[PDB]
């Protein structure tokens, strides 16, 4: 009974994030010479052009990592990441201007990605 002012007594268990959403694992490579760090909630197909991965598998998705965290890719680093599905209305506006609407417009997103030189449009 030593008192730590304002201490927590957390309940038992674990918190499952993004429960009930499809997960997908993909390989991603930083082909650039500078580090790239990607946050939990960026539409994954719209990340830095020099990240090489199957861009189609990024559409309608983001990293399956705790809210507010980020995945780091050192220059030349290739690693696997796990993606989860976007929720809400499944619409993306802005960011890299690849979507500007429904994430269901896969053909249009990849055409824009290919024209602007986002690596990995297959």
């Amino acid at each position: 009974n030593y008192i730590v002012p304002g201490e927590y007594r957390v309940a038992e268990g674990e918190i499952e994030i993004n429960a009930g959403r499809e997960k997908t694992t993909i390989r991603v490579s930083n082909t650039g010479d500078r580090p790239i760090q990607v946050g939990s909630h960026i539409h994954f197909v719209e990340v830095n052009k020099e990240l090489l991965f199957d861009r189609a598998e990024g559409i309608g998705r983001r990293l399956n990592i705790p809210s507010g965290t980020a995945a780091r890719f050192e220059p030349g680093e290739e690693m696997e990441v796990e993606l989860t599905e976007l929720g809400g209305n499944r619409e993306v506006f802005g960011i890299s201007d690849l979507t500007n609407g429904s994430v269901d417009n896969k053909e249009l997103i990849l055409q824009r990605a290919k024209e602007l030189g986002y690596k990995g449009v297959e």
Binding site: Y2, I3, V4, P5, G6, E7
Partner: protein, 100 residues
């Protein structure tokens, strides 16, 4: 003297540290603001002495120990921050978990 606003404010820290050191000298376990004042004044006097930021980051962890303060005070102080004029200008010192 040409005191600026920060110089006026920081005299209070010195004063609170003197108050706290008098309380420690008559045998009291120090409370949260007393402990913070003592460690903060130590940092600003160290800068005045010409110590480095790295020296004060080290020394600031050994100014007060658990048995100098009341129960729970070590766990209330996660870090103490102070800015002072070093020989190379104002710098920020952060002392992490100063009372272990």
């Amino acid at each position: 003297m040409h005191l600026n606003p920060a110089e006026k404010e920081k005299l209070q820290i010195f004063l609170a540290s003197e108050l706290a050191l008098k309380r420690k000298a008559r045998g009291l376990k120090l409370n949260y603001p007393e402990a913070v004042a003592i460690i903060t004044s130590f940092i600003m006097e160290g800068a005045r002495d010409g110590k480095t930021v790295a020296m004060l980051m080290e020394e600031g962890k050994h100014v007060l120990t658990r048995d100098d303060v009341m129960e729970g005070v070590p766990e209330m102080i996660d870090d103490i921050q102070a800015e002072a004029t070093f020989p190379d200008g104002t710098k920020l010192v952060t002392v992490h978990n100063p009372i272990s």
